[PDB]
Amino acid sequence: GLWDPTLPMIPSANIPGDPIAVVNQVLGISATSAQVTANMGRKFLEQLGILQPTDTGITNAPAGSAQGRIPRVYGRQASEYVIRRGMSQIGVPYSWGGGNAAGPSKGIDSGAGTVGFDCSGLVLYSFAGVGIKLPHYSGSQYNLGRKIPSSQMRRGDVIFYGPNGSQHVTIYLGNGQMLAAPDVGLKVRVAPVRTAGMTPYVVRYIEY
């Protein structure tokens, strides 16, 4: 019962730090996921009419806090933007280690030749659109945000599997459906929530 037995029963891809997300060989520029995330967060705060000169664009709450940068009155809007980002990626192939704040990417190790997403990649891409910066490893994502009992998961919360949430991570859509790419040969999809191997808590990154 520790793992979801429909997927490889191993910790998932773990990419350290703040990878390069954007390389433009013609202008001679590049930028990392956190750069892209901060820019998107500032744009989103400006779209809400609340950008301040002190805003970096990074909008995460301190881990465990129910108070973060985006006001609760705007959280449903933020959550729906995150969900729209992710749903826009339906059909993109699975790649082990795939994805960054800018979009699908090449993976690592066996995924090195395949441009796509893994769950943690897709989660970090989708949340980055409102300035929520997450590491590219499901285990480390599980240690951020605020825990909600899995029985109370709500649309926009993030579902984790395996010990320490290391096996797989998906975005909950409500109505018993979740969004992720599962494994090789498959693509980002909407699928029924699976309870086998589910951690006892989901994580909420956006309050509303």
mmCIF file with all atom_site columns, C-alpha atoms in Angstrom:
data_model
loop_
_atom_site.group_PDB
_atom_site.id
_atom_site.type_symbol
_atom_site.label_atom_id
_atom_site.label_alt_id
_atom_site.label_comp_id
_atom_site.label_asym_id
_atom_site.label_entity_id
_atom_site.label_seq_id
_atom_site.pdbx_PDB_ins_code
_atom_site.Cartn_x
_atom_site.Cartn_y
_atom_site.Cartn_z
_atom_site.occupancy
_atom_site.B_iso_or_equiv
_atom_site.pdbx_formal_charge
_atom_site.auth_seq_id
_atom_site.auth_comp_id
_atom_site.auth_asym_id
_atom_site.auth_atom_id
_atom_site.pdbx_PDB_model_num
ATOM 1   C CA . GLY A 1 1   ? 0.000   0.000  0.000   1.00 0.00 ? 1   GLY A CA 1
ATOM 2   C CA . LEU A 1 2   ? 3.023   2.449  0.163   1.00 0.00 ? 2   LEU A CA 1
ATOM 3   C CA . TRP A 1 3   ? 3.185   3.138  -3.588  1.00 0.00 ? 3   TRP A CA 1
ATOM 4   C CA . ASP A 1 4   ? 0.666   3.500  -6.398  1.00 0.00 ? 4   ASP A CA 1
ATOM 5   C CA . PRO A 1 5   ? 1.245   0.112  -8.051  1.00 0.00 ? 5   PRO A CA 1
ATOM 6   C CA . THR A 1 6   ? 0.256   1.382  -11.498 1.00 0.00 ? 6   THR A CA 1
ATOM 7   C CA . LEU A 1 7   ? 3.496   3.423  -11.760 1.00 0.00 ? 7   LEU A CA 1
ATOM 8   C CA . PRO A 1 8   ? 7.164   2.531  -11.145 1.00 0.00 ? 8   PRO A CA 1
ATOM 9   C CA . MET A 1 9   ? 7.486   2.131  -7.323  1.00 0.00 ? 9   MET A CA 1
ATOM 10  C CA . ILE A 1 10  ? 10.540  4.448  -6.995  1.00 0.00 ? 10  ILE A CA 1
ATOM 11  C CA . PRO A 1 11  ? 11.291  8.051  -6.086  1.00 0.00 ? 11  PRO A CA 1
ATOM 12  C CA . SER A 1 12  ? 10.684  10.302 -9.031  1.00 0.00 ? 12  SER A CA 1
ATOM 13  C CA . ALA A 1 13  ? 13.032  12.715 -10.856 1.00 0.00 ? 13  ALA A CA 1
ATOM 14  C CA . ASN A 1 14  ? 14.954  15.109 -8.629  1.00 0.00 ? 14  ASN A CA 1
ATOM 15  C CA . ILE A 1 15  ? 16.454  18.139 -10.377 1.00 0.00 ? 15  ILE A CA 1
ATOM 16  C CA . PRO A 1 16  ? 18.424  20.451 -8.031  1.00 0.00 ? 16  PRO A CA 1
ATOM 17  C CA . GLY A 1 17  ? 18.304  24.224 -7.632  1.00 0.00 ? 17  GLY A CA 1
ATOM 18  C CA . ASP A 1 18  ? 17.110  26.636 -10.248 1.00 0.00 ? 18  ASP A CA 1
ATOM 19  C CA . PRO A 1 19  ? 17.562  25.208 -13.758 1.00 0.00 ? 19  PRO A CA 1
ATOM 20  C CA . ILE A 1 20  ? 17.887  27.245 -16.899 1.00 0.00 ? 20  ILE A CA 1
ATOM 21  C CA . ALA A 1 21  ? 14.348  27.469 -18.432 1.00 0.00 ? 21  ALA A CA 1
ATOM 22  C CA . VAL A 1 22  ? 14.867  29.698 -21.474 1.00 0.00 ? 22  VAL A CA 1
ATOM 23  C CA . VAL A 1 23  ? 17.808  29.671 -23.927 1.00 0.00 ? 23  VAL A CA 1
ATOM 24  C CA . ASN A 1 24  ? 17.632  32.076 -26.942 1.00 0.00 ? 24  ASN A CA 1
ATOM 25  C CA . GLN A 1 25  ? 20.688  31.435 -29.119 1.00 0.00 ? 25  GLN A CA 1
ATOM 26  C CA . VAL A 1 26  ? 19.794  34.372 -31.439 1.00 0.00 ? 26  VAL A CA 1
ATOM 27  C CA . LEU A 1 27  ? 19.497  37.164 -28.876 1.00 0.00 ? 27  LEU A CA 1
ATOM 28  C CA . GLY A 1 28  ? 22.253  35.470 -26.751 1.00 0.00 ? 28  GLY A CA 1
ATOM 29  C CA . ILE A 1 29  ? 20.123  35.249 -23.594 1.00 0.00 ? 29  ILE A CA 1
ATOM 30  C CA . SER A 1 30  ? 18.989  32.706 -21.119 1.00 0.00 ? 30  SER A CA 1
ATOM 31  C CA . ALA A 1 31  ? 17.068  32.755 -17.836 1.00 0.00 ? 31  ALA A CA 1
ATOM 32  C CA . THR A 1 32  ? 16.243  30.275 -15.068 1.00 0.00 ? 32  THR A CA 1
ATOM 33  C CA . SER A 1 33  ? 12.877  28.971 -13.805 1.00 0.00 ? 33  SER A CA 1
ATOM 34  C CA . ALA A 1 34  ? 12.942  31.367 -10.848 1.00 0.00 ? 34  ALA A CA 1
ATOM 35  C CA . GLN A 1 35  ? 13.552  34.333 -13.163 1.00 0.00 ? 35  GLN A CA 1
ATOM 36  C CA . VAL A 1 36  ? 10.666  33.330 -15.396 1.00 0.00 ? 36  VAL A CA 1
ATOM 37  C CA . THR A 1 37  ? 8.525   32.711 -12.254 1.00 0.00 ? 37  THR A CA 1
ATOM 38  C CA . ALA A 1 38  ? 9.257   36.075 -10.691 1.00 0.00 ? 38  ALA A CA 1
ATOM 39  C CA . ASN A 1 39  ? 8.427   37.883 -13.957 1.00 0.00 ? 39  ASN A CA 1
ATOM 40  C CA . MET A 1 40  ? 5.139   35.944 -14.277 1.00 0.00 ? 40  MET A CA 1
ATOM 41  C CA . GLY A 1 41  ? 4.296   36.648 -10.613 1.00 0.00 ? 41  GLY A CA 1
ATOM 42  C CA . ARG A 1 42  ? 4.853   40.411 -11.065 1.00 0.00 ? 42  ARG A CA 1
ATOM 43  C CA . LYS A 1 43  ? 2.684   40.328 -14.236 1.00 0.00 ? 43  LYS A CA 1
ATOM 44  C CA . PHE A 1 44  ? -0.054  38.513 -12.347 1.00 0.00 ? 44  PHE A CA 1
ATOM 45  C CA . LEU A 1 45  ? 0.064   40.884 -9.405  1.00 0.00 ? 45  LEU A CA 1
ATOM 46  C CA . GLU A 1 46  ? -0.100  43.836 -11.863 1.00 0.00 ? 46  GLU A CA 1
ATOM 47  C CA . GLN A 1 47  ? -3.175  42.129 -13.553 1.00 0.00 ? 47  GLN A CA 1
ATOM 48  C CA . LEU A 1 48  ? -4.862  42.062 -10.089 1.00 0.00 ? 48  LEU A CA 1
ATOM 49  C CA . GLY A 1 49  ? -4.008  45.824 -9.591  1.00 0.00 ? 49  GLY A CA 1
ATOM 50  C CA . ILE A 1 50  ? -1.850  45.134 -6.547  1.00 0.00 ? 50  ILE A CA 1
ATOM 51  C CA . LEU A 1 51  ? 1.812   45.137 -7.669  1.00 0.00 ? 51  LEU A CA 1
ATOM 52  C CA . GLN A 1 52  ? 4.102   46.934 -5.189  1.00 0.00 ? 52  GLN A CA 1
ATOM 53  C CA . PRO A 1 53  ? 7.668   48.096 -5.597  1.00 0.00 ? 53  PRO A CA 1
ATOM 54  C CA . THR A 1 54  ? 8.712   45.549 -2.930  1.00 0.00 ? 54  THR A CA 1
ATOM 55  C CA . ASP A 1 55  ? 7.237   42.620 -4.945  1.00 0.00 ? 55  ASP A CA 1
ATOM 56  C CA . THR A 1 56  ? 9.819   40.228 -6.376  1.00 0.00 ? 56  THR A CA 1
ATOM 57  C CA . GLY A 1 57  ? 6.995   38.285 -7.999  1.00 0.00 ? 57  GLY A CA 1
ATOM 58  C CA . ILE A 1 58  ? 7.623   35.235 -5.874  1.00 0.00 ? 58  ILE A CA 1
ATOM 59  C CA . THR A 1 59  ? 4.308   34.684 -4.139  1.00 0.00 ? 59  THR A CA 1
ATOM 60  C CA . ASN A 1 60  ? 4.728   31.480 -2.056  1.00 0.00 ? 60  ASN A CA 1
ATOM 61  C CA . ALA A 1 61  ? 3.432   31.572 1.596   1.00 0.00 ? 61  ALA A CA 1
ATOM 62  C CA . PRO A 1 62  ? 6.029   30.550 4.265   1.00 0.00 ? 62  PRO A CA 1
ATOM 63  C CA . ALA A 1 63  ? 5.646   26.759 4.451   1.00 0.00 ? 63  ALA A CA 1
ATOM 64  C CA . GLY A 1 64  ? 2.631   25.969 6.627   1.00 0.00 ? 64  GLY A CA 1
ATOM 65  C CA . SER A 1 65  ? 1.322   29.521 6.781   1.00 0.00 ? 65  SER A CA 1
ATOM 66  C CA . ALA A 1 66  ? -2.238  30.203 5.670   1.00 0.00 ? 66  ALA A CA 1
ATOM 67  C CA . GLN A 1 67  ? -1.167  33.801 4.716   1.00 0.00 ? 67  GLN A CA 1
ATOM 68  C CA . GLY A 1 68  ? 0.793   34.511 1.546   1.00 0.00 ? 68  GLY A CA 1
ATOM 69  C CA . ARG A 1 69  ? 1.195   37.283 -1.015  1.00 0.00 ? 69  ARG A CA 1
ATOM 70  C CA . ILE A 1 70  ? -1.875  36.718 -3.144  1.00 0.00 ? 70  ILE A CA 1
ATOM 71  C CA . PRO A 1 71  ? -5.013  37.987 -1.291  1.00 0.00 ? 71  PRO A CA 1
ATOM 72  C CA . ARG A 1 72  ? -7.616  35.318 -0.596  1.00 0.00 ? 72  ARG A CA 1
ATOM 73  C CA . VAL A 1 73  ? -10.213 37.308 -2.636  1.00 0.00 ? 73  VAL A CA 1
ATOM 74  C CA . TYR A 1 74  ? -8.092  36.670 -5.705  1.00 0.00 ? 74  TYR A CA 1
ATOM 75  C CA . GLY A 1 75  ? -7.098  33.066 -4.911  1.00 0.00 ? 75  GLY A CA 1
ATOM 76  C CA . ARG A 1 76  ? -9.839  31.394 -6.952  1.00 0.00 ? 76  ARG A CA 1
ATOM 77  C CA . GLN A 1 77  ? -8.745  33.485 -9.971  1.00 0.00 ? 77  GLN A CA 1
ATOM 78  C CA . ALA A 1 78  ? -5.086  32.525 -9.332  1.00 0.00 ? 78  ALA A CA 1
ATOM 79  C CA . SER A 1 79  ? -6.029  28.845 -8.911  1.00 0.00 ? 79  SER A CA 1
ATOM 80  C CA . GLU A 1 80  ? -8.018  28.854 -12.158 1.00 0.00 ? 80  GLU A CA 1
ATOM 81  C CA . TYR A 1 81  ? -5.119  30.429 -14.050 1.00 0.00 ? 81  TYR A CA 1
ATOM 82  C CA . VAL A 1 82  ? -2.788  27.746 -12.710 1.00 0.00 ? 82  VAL A CA 1
ATOM 83  C CA . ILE A 1 83  ? -5.291  25.056 -13.740 1.00 0.00 ? 83  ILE A CA 1
ATOM 84  C CA . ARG A 1 84  ? -5.715  26.592 -17.222 1.00 0.00 ? 84  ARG A CA 1
ATOM 85  C CA . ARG A 1 85  ? -1.919  26.511 -17.670 1.00 0.00 ? 85  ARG A CA 1
ATOM 86  C CA . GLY A 1 86  ? -1.735  22.898 -16.775 1.00 0.00 ? 86  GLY A CA 1
ATOM 87  C CA . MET A 1 87  ? -4.813  21.867 -18.858 1.00 0.00 ? 87  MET A CA 1
ATOM 88  C CA . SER A 1 88  ? -3.234  23.650 -21.858 1.00 0.00 ? 88  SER A CA 1
ATOM 89  C CA . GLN A 1 89  ? -0.557  21.012 -21.721 1.00 0.00 ? 89  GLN A CA 1
ATOM 90  C CA . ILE A 1 90  ? -2.903  18.016 -22.240 1.00 0.00 ? 90  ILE A CA 1
ATOM 91  C CA . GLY A 1 91  ? -1.234  15.773 -24.838 1.00 0.00 ? 91  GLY A CA 1
ATOM 92  C CA . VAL A 1 92  ? 2.334   16.824 -24.160 1.00 0.00 ? 92  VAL A CA 1
ATOM 93  C CA . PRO A 1 93  ? 4.431   13.592 -23.719 1.00 0.00 ? 93  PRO A CA 1
ATOM 94  C CA . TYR A 1 94  ? 5.682   12.264 -20.438 1.00 0.00 ? 94  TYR A CA 1
ATOM 95  C CA . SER A 1 95  ? 9.462   12.804 -19.917 1.00 0.00 ? 95  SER A CA 1
ATOM 96  C CA . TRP A 1 96  ? 11.318  11.748 -16.758 1.00 0.00 ? 96  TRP A CA 1
ATOM 97  C CA . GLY A 1 97  ? 12.681  15.080 -15.419 1.00 0.00 ? 97  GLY A CA 1
ATOM 98  C CA . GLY A 1 98  ? 10.823  17.027 -18.070 1.00 0.00 ? 98  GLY A CA 1
ATOM 99  C CA . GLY A 1 99  ? 9.652   20.627 -17.725 1.00 0.00 ? 99  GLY A CA 1
ATOM 100 C CA . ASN A 1 100 ? 10.540  24.006 -16.240 1.00 0.00 ? 100 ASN A CA 1
ATOM 101 C CA . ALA A 1 101 ? 8.745   27.256 -15.520 1.00 0.00 ? 101 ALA A CA 1
ATOM 102 C CA . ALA A 1 102 ? 8.694   28.151 -19.225 1.00 0.00 ? 102 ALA A CA 1
ATOM 103 C CA . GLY A 1 103 ? 7.102   24.937 -20.530 1.00 0.00 ? 103 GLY A CA 1
ATOM 104 C CA . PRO A 1 104 ? 7.893   21.340 -21.330 1.00 0.00 ? 104 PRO A CA 1
ATOM 105 C CA . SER A 1 105 ? 11.628  20.555 -21.601 1.00 0.00 ? 105 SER A CA 1
ATOM 106 C CA . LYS A 1 106 ? 14.071  17.808 -22.084 1.00 0.00 ? 106 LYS A CA 1
ATOM 107 C CA . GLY A 1 107 ? 14.312  15.463 -19.074 1.00 0.00 ? 107 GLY A CA 1
ATOM 108 C CA . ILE A 1 108 ? 17.248  13.869 -17.332 1.00 0.00 ? 108 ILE A CA 1
ATOM 109 C CA . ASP A 1 109 ? 18.833  10.467 -17.458 1.00 0.00 ? 109 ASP A CA 1
ATOM 110 C CA . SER A 1 110 ? 16.441  8.202  -19.507 1.00 0.00 ? 110 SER A CA 1
ATOM 111 C CA . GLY A 1 111 ? 14.299  11.321 -20.311 1.00 0.00 ? 111 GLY A CA 1
ATOM 112 C CA . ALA A 1 112 ? 17.254  13.294 -21.726 1.00 0.00 ? 112 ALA A CA 1
ATOM 113 C CA . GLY A 1 113 ? 16.119  13.029 -25.333 1.00 0.00 ? 113 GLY A CA 1
ATOM 114 C CA . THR A 1 114 ? 12.447  13.590 -24.747 1.00 0.00 ? 114 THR A CA 1
ATOM 115 C CA . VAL A 1 115 ? 10.839  17.030 -24.460 1.00 0.00 ? 115 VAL A CA 1
ATOM 116 C CA . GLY A 1 116 ? 7.818   16.766 -22.132 1.00 0.00 ? 116 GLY A CA 1
ATOM 117 C CA . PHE A 1 117 ? 6.675   16.856 -18.494 1.00 0.00 ? 117 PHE A CA 1
ATOM 118 C CA . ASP A 1 118 ? 6.821   14.747 -15.435 1.00 0.00 ? 118 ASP A CA 1
ATOM 119 C CA . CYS A 1 119 ? 4.363   15.460 -12.614 1.00 0.00 ? 119 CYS A CA 1
ATOM 120 C CA . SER A 1 120 ? 6.573   17.687 -10.628 1.00 0.00 ? 120 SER A CA 1
ATOM 121 C CA . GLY A 1 121 ? 7.573   19.491 -13.833 1.00 0.00 ? 121 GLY A CA 1
ATOM 122 C CA . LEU A 1 122 ? 3.960   20.071 -14.766 1.00 0.00 ? 122 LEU A CA 1
ATOM 123 C CA . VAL A 1 123 ? 3.100   21.253 -11.245 1.00 0.00 ? 123 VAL A CA 1
ATOM 124 C CA . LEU A 1 124 ? 6.016   23.688 -11.167 1.00 0.00 ? 124 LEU A CA 1
ATOM 125 C CA . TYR A 1 125 ? 5.156   24.991 -14.677 1.00 0.00 ? 125 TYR A CA 1
ATOM 126 C CA . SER A 1 126 ? 1.452   25.508 -13.886 1.00 0.00 ? 126 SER A CA 1
ATOM 127 C CA . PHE A 1 127 ? 1.984   27.236 -10.499 1.00 0.00 ? 127 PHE A CA 1
ATOM 128 C CA . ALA A 1 128 ? 4.758   29.427 -11.801 1.00 0.00 ? 128 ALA A CA 1
ATOM 129 C CA . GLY A 1 129 ? 2.190   31.445 -13.807 1.00 0.00 ? 129 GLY A CA 1
ATOM 130 C CA . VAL A 1 130 ? 1.119   33.207 -10.533 1.00 0.00 ? 130 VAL A CA 1
ATOM 131 C CA . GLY A 1 131 ? 4.618   33.474 -9.001  1.00 0.00 ? 131 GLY A CA 1
ATOM 132 C CA . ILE A 1 132 ? 4.509   30.209 -6.958  1.00 0.00 ? 132 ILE A CA 1
ATOM 133 C CA . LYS A 1 133 ? 8.091   28.869 -7.243  1.00 0.00 ? 133 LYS A CA 1
ATOM 134 C CA . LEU A 1 134 ? 8.483   25.124 -6.624  1.00 0.00 ? 134 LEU A CA 1
ATOM 135 C CA . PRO A 1 135 ? 11.502  22.811 -6.852  1.00 0.00 ? 135 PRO A CA 1
ATOM 136 C CA . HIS A 1 136 ? 11.613  20.145 -9.545  1.00 0.00 ? 136 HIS A CA 1
ATOM 137 C CA . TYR A 1 137 ? 11.172  17.159 -7.199  1.00 0.00 ? 137 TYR A CA 1
ATOM 138 C CA . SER A 1 138 ? 7.864   15.895 -5.898  1.00 0.00 ? 138 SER A CA 1
ATOM 139 C CA . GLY A 1 139 ? 9.434   15.043 -2.516  1.00 0.00 ? 139 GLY A CA 1
ATOM 140 C CA . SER A 1 140 ? 10.518  18.646 -1.991  1.00 0.00 ? 140 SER A CA 1
ATOM 141 C CA . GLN A 1 141 ? 7.204   20.082 -3.271  1.00 0.00 ? 141 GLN A CA 1
ATOM 142 C CA . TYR A 1 142 ? 5.419   18.026 -0.602  1.00 0.00 ? 142 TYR A CA 1
ATOM 143 C CA . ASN A 1 143 ? 7.392   19.989 2.115   1.00 0.00 ? 143 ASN A CA 1
ATOM 144 C CA . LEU A 1 144 ? 6.125   23.362 0.842   1.00 0.00 ? 144 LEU A CA 1
ATOM 145 C CA . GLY A 1 145 ? 2.647   25.000 1.006   1.00 0.00 ? 145 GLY A CA 1
ATOM 146 C CA . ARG A 1 146 ? -0.017  24.010 3.579   1.00 0.00 ? 146 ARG A CA 1
ATOM 147 C CA . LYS A 1 147 ? -1.238  20.488 4.273   1.00 0.00 ? 147 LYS A CA 1
ATOM 148 C CA . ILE A 1 148 ? -5.001  19.658 3.837   1.00 0.00 ? 148 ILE A CA 1
ATOM 149 C CA . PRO A 1 149 ? -6.328  16.160 4.826   1.00 0.00 ? 149 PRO A CA 1
ATOM 150 C CA . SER A 1 150 ? -6.588  14.153 1.594   1.00 0.00 ? 150 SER A CA 1
ATOM 151 C CA . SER A 1 151 ? -10.229 13.429 2.326   1.00 0.00 ? 151 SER A CA 1
ATOM 152 C CA . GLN A 1 152 ? -10.795 17.200 2.032   1.00 0.00 ? 152 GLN A CA 1
ATOM 153 C CA . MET A 1 153 ? -8.860  17.826 -1.160  1.00 0.00 ? 153 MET A CA 1
ATOM 154 C CA . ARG A 1 154 ? -10.246 20.728 -3.157  1.00 0.00 ? 154 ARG A CA 1
ATOM 155 C CA . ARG A 1 155 ? -9.862  21.762 -6.810  1.00 0.00 ? 155 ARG A CA 1
ATOM 156 C CA . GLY A 1 156 ? -6.374  23.308 -7.266  1.00 0.00 ? 156 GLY A CA 1
ATOM 157 C CA . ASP A 1 157 ? -4.791  21.384 -4.388  1.00 0.00 ? 157 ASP A CA 1
ATOM 158 C CA . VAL A 1 158 ? -1.872  19.103 -5.298  1.00 0.00 ? 158 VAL A CA 1
ATOM 159 C CA . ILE A 1 159 ? -1.965  15.306 -4.699  1.00 0.00 ? 159 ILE A CA 1
ATOM 160 C CA . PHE A 1 160 ? 1.140   13.336 -3.803  1.00 0.00 ? 160 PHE A CA 1
ATOM 161 C CA . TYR A 1 161 ? 2.039   9.613  -3.873  1.00 0.00 ? 161 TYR A CA 1
ATOM 162 C CA . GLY A 1 162 ? 4.685   7.357  -2.264  1.00 0.00 ? 162 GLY A CA 1
ATOM 163 C CA . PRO A 1 163 ? 6.796   7.892  0.816   1.00 0.00 ? 163 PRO A CA 1
ATOM 164 C CA . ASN A 1 164 ? 7.343   11.636 1.431   1.00 0.00 ? 164 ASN A CA 1
ATOM 165 C CA . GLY A 1 165 ? 5.317   12.273 -1.783  1.00 0.00 ? 165 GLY A CA 1
ATOM 166 C CA . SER A 1 166 ? 8.349   11.042 -3.741  1.00 0.00 ? 166 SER A CA 1
ATOM 167 C CA . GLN A 1 167 ? 6.645   8.772  -6.318  1.00 0.00 ? 167 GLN A CA 1
ATOM 168 C CA . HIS A 1 168 ? 4.344   11.104 -8.242  1.00 0.00 ? 168 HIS A CA 1
ATOM 169 C CA . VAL A 1 169 ? 2.492   14.393 -7.960  1.00 0.00 ? 169 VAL A CA 1
ATOM 170 C CA . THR A 1 170 ? -0.668  15.626 -9.821  1.00 0.00 ? 170 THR A CA 1
ATOM 171 C CA . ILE A 1 171 ? -2.995  18.619 -9.727  1.00 0.00 ? 171 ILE A CA 1
ATOM 172 C CA . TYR A 1 172 ? -6.475  17.910 -8.356  1.00 0.00 ? 172 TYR A CA 1
ATOM 173 C CA . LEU A 1 173 ? -9.284  19.251 -10.629 1.00 0.00 ? 173 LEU A CA 1
ATOM 174 C CA . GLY A 1 174 ? -12.292 18.530 -8.339  1.00 0.00 ? 174 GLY A CA 1
ATOM 175 C CA . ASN A 1 175 ? -14.925 15.886 -9.124  1.00 0.00 ? 175 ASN A CA 1
ATOM 176 C CA . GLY A 1 176 ? -12.536 12.993 -8.507  1.00 0.00 ? 176 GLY A CA 1
ATOM 177 C CA . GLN A 1 177 ? -10.239 13.968 -11.499 1.00 0.00 ? 177 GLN A CA 1
ATOM 178 C CA . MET A 1 178 ? -6.578  14.932 -11.536 1.00 0.00 ? 178 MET A CA 1
ATOM 179 C CA . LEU A 1 179 ? -4.059  16.230 -14.125 1.00 0.00 ? 179 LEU A CA 1
ATOM 180 C CA . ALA A 1 180 ? -0.629  14.760 -14.748 1.00 0.00 ? 180 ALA A CA 1
ATOM 181 C CA . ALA A 1 181 ? 1.549   12.805 -17.218 1.00 0.00 ? 181 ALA A CA 1
ATOM 182 C CA . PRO A 1 182 ? 1.864   9.293  -15.660 1.00 0.00 ? 182 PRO A CA 1
ATOM 183 C CA . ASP A 1 183 ? 4.703   7.409  -17.269 1.00 0.00 ? 183 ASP A CA 1
ATOM 184 C CA . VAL A 1 184 ? 6.621   6.604  -20.460 1.00 0.00 ? 184 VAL A CA 1
ATOM 185 C CA . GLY A 1 185 ? 4.586   6.281  -23.638 1.00 0.00 ? 185 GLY A CA 1
ATOM 186 C CA . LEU A 1 186 ? 1.784   8.359  -22.157 1.00 0.00 ? 186 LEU A CA 1
ATOM 187 C CA . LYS A 1 187 ? 1.007   12.101 -22.161 1.00 0.00 ? 187 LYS A CA 1
ATOM 188 C CA . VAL A 1 188 ? -0.295  14.765 -19.768 1.00 0.00 ? 188 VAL A CA 1
ATOM 189 C CA . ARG A 1 189 ? -3.919  13.748 -19.152 1.00 0.00 ? 189 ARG A CA 1
ATOM 190 C CA . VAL A 1 190 ? -6.982  14.063 -17.009 1.00 0.00 ? 190 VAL A CA 1
ATOM 191 C CA . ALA A 1 191 ? -7.494  10.809 -15.138 1.00 0.00 ? 191 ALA A CA 1
ATOM 192 C CA . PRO A 1 192 ? -9.494  9.606  -12.079 1.00 0.00 ? 192 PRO A CA 1
ATOM 193 C CA . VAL A 1 193 ? -7.844  10.222 -8.741  1.00 0.00 ? 193 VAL A CA 1
ATOM 194 C CA . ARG A 1 194 ? -6.069  7.067  -7.521  1.00 0.00 ? 194 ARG A CA 1
ATOM 195 C CA . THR A 1 195 ? -5.989  6.502  -3.726  1.00 0.00 ? 195 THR A CA 1
ATOM 196 C CA . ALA A 1 196 ? -3.418  3.701  -3.746  1.00 0.00 ? 196 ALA A CA 1
ATOM 197 C CA . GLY A 1 197 ? -0.105  5.125  -2.459  1.00 0.00 ? 197 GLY A CA 1
ATOM 198 C CA . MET A 1 198 ? -1.702  8.560  -1.842  1.00 0.00 ? 198 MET A CA 1
ATOM 199 C CA . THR A 1 199 ? -0.088  10.561 0.938   1.00 0.00 ? 199 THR A CA 1
ATOM 200 C CA . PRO A 1 200 ? -2.383  11.329 3.858   1.00 0.00 ? 200 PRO A CA 1
ATOM 201 C CA . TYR A 1 201 ? -2.360  15.070 3.025   1.00 0.00 ? 201 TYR A CA 1
ATOM 202 C CA . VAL A 1 202 ? -2.669  17.106 -0.170  1.00 0.00 ? 202 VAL A CA 1
ATOM 203 C CA . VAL A 1 203 ? -0.836  20.420 -0.420  1.00 0.00 ? 203 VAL A CA 1
ATOM 204 C CA . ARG A 1 204 ? -2.496  23.809 -0.942  1.00 0.00 ? 204 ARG A CA 1
ATOM 205 C CA . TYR A 1 205 ? -0.294  26.546 -2.481  1.00 0.00 ? 205 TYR A CA 1
ATOM 206 C CA . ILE A 1 206 ? -3.091  29.134 -3.082  1.00 0.00 ? 206 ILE A CA 1
ATOM 207 C CA . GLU A 1 207 ? -5.683  30.036 -0.469  1.00 0.00 ? 207 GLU A CA 1
ATOM 208 C CA . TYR A 1 208 ? -9.252  30.972 -1.314  1.00 0.00 ? 208 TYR A CA 1
#
